[PDB]
Structure formats: C-alpha cells, structure tokens
C-alpha cells in the first residue's frame, strides 16, 4: 500500500490546545486525528478507514 | 423518394456504458485529470463516430 505521509512532512503542525472559540470548533493543526480517522496516501489523498459499526 | 431514420445500436450504447464503468471502477488512486481524460476520449470516440445517430 501507499506509504501514509507523516504529520512531520507537512510541518507547521502547532500543538494547539484550545478546543473551540466563538462557538465554532478549532481544528487541530496536527493531522494525527485525521490520519487516525482515515489515512492519507503517498500523494495527499484520503483513503478513509471504513467505519464498520 | 425516401428517408432513413438513424439510431445507435443497443450494442454500441452498452459498450460505451461499460467503458465509462471501467473508467469509474478502475480509478482508485488516479488523479482527476486522468479520469477526465479517459472520459473525454470515450465521448469523442462515440460522438464523432455516431454523429447524428446520437442526436
């Protein structure tokens, strides 16, 4: 399978801690959560881990 | 003295439809440009071979 790109590859993934501000949520600057939800590919695609539940 | 109404063979329509199905099904990780290139190739082949029969 295509090697999932590391979150260090993008860089500038500041470890923000604020969950939300002004009602709207605050997305994490780190792609660890998105990678966990569904892995990237070697060229920035989004093969999503099939949620069988 | 006559007319000749034209159509496209059911076989040809099914063949083109199966080609587009091959396009979508075999995609996976290909770029979007390749997918649209294959679509345009199929459309041009069909619509320049069957010019009025498509209409």
UniProtKB/Swiss-Prot annotation, chain A:
Involved in pre-mRNA splicing as component of the U5 snRNP complex that is involved in spliceosome assembly. It is found in: Cytoplasm; Nucleus. The lineage of its organism: Eukaryota, Metazoa, Chordata, Craniata, Vertebrata. Component of the U5 snRNP complex composed of the U5 snRNA and at least PRPF6, PRPF8, SNRNP200, EFTUD2, SNRNP40, DDX23, TXNL4A and CD2BP2. Interacts directly with TXNL4A and PRPF6. Interacts (via GYF domain) with CD2 (via Pro-rich sequence in the cytoplasmic domain). Interacts with PQBP1. The gene is CD2BP2. The chain holds residues 62 to 114 of 341 of the full protein. This is CD2 antigen cytoplasmic tail-binding protein 2. Transmembrane segments: none annotated.
From Swiss-Prot, chain B:
Widely expressed. It is found in: Nucleus; Nucleus speckle. It comes from the Eukaryota. Plays a role in pre-mRNA splicing as core component of precatalytic, catalytic and postcatalytic spliceosomal complexes, both of the predominant U2-type spliceosome and the minor U12-type spliceosome. Functions as a scaffold that mediates the ordered assembly of spliceosomal proteins and snRNAs. Required for the assembly of the U4/U6-U5 tri-snRNP complex, a building block of the spliceosome. Functions as a scaffold that positions spliceosomal U2, U5 and U6 snRNAs at splice sites on pre-mRNA substrates, so that splicing can occur. Interacts with both the 5' and the 3' splice site. Part of the U5 snRNP complex. Component of the U4/U6-U5 tri-snRNP complex composed of the U4, U6 and U5 snRNAs and at least PRPF3, PRPF4, PRPF6, PRPF8, PRPF31, SNRNP200, TXNL4A, SNRNP40, DDX23, CD2BP2, PPIH, SNU13, EFTUD2, SART1 and USP39. Component of the U5.U4atac/U6atac snRNP complexes in U12-dependent spliceosomes. Within the minor spliceosome, which acts on U12-type introns, interacts with PPIL2 and RBM48. Core component of U2-type precatalytic, catalytic and postcatalytic spliceosomal complexes. Found in a mRNA splicing-dependent exon junction complex (EJC) with SRRM1. It is linked to Retinitis pigmentosa 13: A retinal dystrophy belonging to the group of pigmentary retinopathies. Retinitis pigmentosa is characterized by retinal pigment deposits visible on fundus examination and primary loss of rod photoreceptor cells followed by secondary loss of cone photoreceptors. Patients typically have night vision blindness and loss of midperipheral visual field. As their condition progresses, they lose their far peripheral visual field and eventually central vision as well. The MPN (JAB/Mov34) domain mediates interaction with TSSC4 and SNRNP200. Has structural similarity with deubiquitinating enzymes, but lacks the residues that would bind the catalytic metal ion. Contains a region with structural similarity to reverse transcriptase, presenting the classical thumb, fingers and palm architecture, but lacks enzyme activity, since the essential metal-binding residues are not conserved. This is Pre-mRNA-processing-splicing factor 8. It comes from Homo sapiens. The gene is PRPF8. The chain holds residues 1225 to 1279 of 2335 of the full protein.
């Amino acid at each position: 399978k295509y090697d999932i790109l590391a979150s260090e590859d993008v860089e500038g993934q500041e470890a923000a801690t604020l969950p939300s501000e002004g009602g709207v949520r605050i997305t994490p600057f780190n792609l660890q959560e998105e990678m966990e939800e569904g892995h990237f590919d070697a060229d920035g695609n989004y093969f999503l881990n099939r949620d069988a539940q | 003295t006559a007319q000749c109404f034209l159509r496209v063979d059911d076989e040809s329509m099914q063949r083109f439809h199966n080609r587009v199905r091959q396009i979508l099904m075999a995609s996976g990780s290909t770029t979007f440009t390749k997918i649209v290139n294959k679509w345009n190739t199929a459309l041009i082949g069909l619509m320049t071979y069957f010019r009025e029969a498509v209409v």
